[PDB]
Amino acid sequence: STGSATTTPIDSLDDAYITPVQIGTPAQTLNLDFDTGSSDLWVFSSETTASEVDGQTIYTPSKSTTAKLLSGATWSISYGDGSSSSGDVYTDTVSVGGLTVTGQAVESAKKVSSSFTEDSTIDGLLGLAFSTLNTVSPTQQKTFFDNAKASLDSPVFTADLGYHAPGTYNFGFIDTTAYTGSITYTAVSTKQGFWEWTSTGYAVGSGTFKSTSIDGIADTGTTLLYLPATVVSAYWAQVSGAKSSSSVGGYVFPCSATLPSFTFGVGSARIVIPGDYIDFGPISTGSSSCFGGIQSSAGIGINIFGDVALKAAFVVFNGATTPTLGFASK
């Protein structure tokens, strides 16, 4: 089997991407944030505290004839961005672009943090990291990809995120028309539950490529590119007027600047992020200072190849017996 769904930026800055997901019988369609950095499928729901729902579409398990309460199961997750949610658990039928899993754990939110409430465009998350990170207690549950794997034509899913445009998540097959050149595959460590890999280095604009190992995660659920402070300083040093702003919380730059591209290595291959992908717009409405899309990972503990990086490539999440990651230019 296969599946294919269109993923769409939530706003004019590509702050995140949403993909429609059918849940229950009859189907309830919610727009979920597909997140290769976490492993819980959770949804706004009829059980969510009413003051914490502000425009999202909710899942109502009582209206799904295939929903079953998972007895005694709860979940609670806290994300790197400081947001959180928690609730109980149903199993139900979940379909993504024609690919169907029965018995998928659907984590129904009773509580969400303020940032989720304030974002009316994201109805929940669909985790695509490794199921070892799933938070359901006392019985950990499997991701949608983990449940679907055995039925897929190939045990893979691909992310093809657009810049200011729609893109695609495919399950079970590689669309060879969706990229140029070849896909370079690189090794993955699952020891922390992430699609963790090692980039072979970087270049800024037209500058010399620096060979240096950058260990980080392919994370469709993080907006920006978070890299070591040495690398990030070298990038922003090429932008006249850029500086690290403590009050804003990272590097900012004059909105009138034209940004250089940023290249990262995948083996001997190179992925070029165009400069405009690094512009995240005025720091506050009406400001002429703009927020940078490449930021220091120094306070994180891990480098994150977020949407800024991934949307420059066609990305293969290969769930073979030994998982690997594939990157192609597009």
State the resolution, in angstroms.
1.4
Dihedral, CA of residue 220, residue 226, residue 228 and residue 229, to nearest 10: 180
Give the Cα separation of 213 and 265 in Å (integer). 9
Contact between 99 and 148 (Cβ < 8 Å): yes
Residue 144 bridge partners (DSSP): none
Give the Cα separation of 250 and 143 in Å (integer). 33
Give the Cα separation of 61 and 42 in Å (integer). 13
User: Which H helix or E strand runs over 231?
Assistant: helix 229-236
Contact between 270 and 199 (Cβ < 8 Å): no
- Residues with catalytic roles: 35, 199
Cα–Cα distance list, 206 to 253, 257, 273, 286, 315 (Å): 20, 17, 12, 32, 24
**Cβ neighbours of 78 (radius 10 Å):** 12
PDB experimental method: X-ray
Q: Shortest CA distance to 113 belongs to which of 68, 146, 76, 139?
A: 76
Segments of 128-249 assigned E as strands: 156-160, 167-171, 184-187, 196-204, 210-218, 225-227, 243-245
Note the residue count of the chain: 330
Q: Shortest CA distance to 316 belongs to which of 160, 212, 141?
A: 160
List all residues 6 or more positions away from 191 whose beta carbon is below 8 Å from its beta carbon.
none
Long-range contacts, 321-324 (Cβ 8 Å, 24+): 323/188, 323/190, 323/195, 324/185, 324/186, 324/187, 324/188
Domain-wise residue ranges, the chain: 5-174, 175-330
Beta strands 196-204 and 294-296 are: unpaired
Place of tokens 């050149």: 181
Q: What tokens appear for 132 in the block?
A: 């070892």
Q: What tokens appear for 31 in the block?
A: 């727009």
For 171-188, give the DSSP string: ES---TTSSSS-PEEEE-
Give the Cα separation of 30 and 43 in Å (integer). 8
Give the Cα separation of 304 and 221 in Å (integer). 10
Angle at Cα 83 formed by Cα 81 and Cα 89, nearest 5°? 130
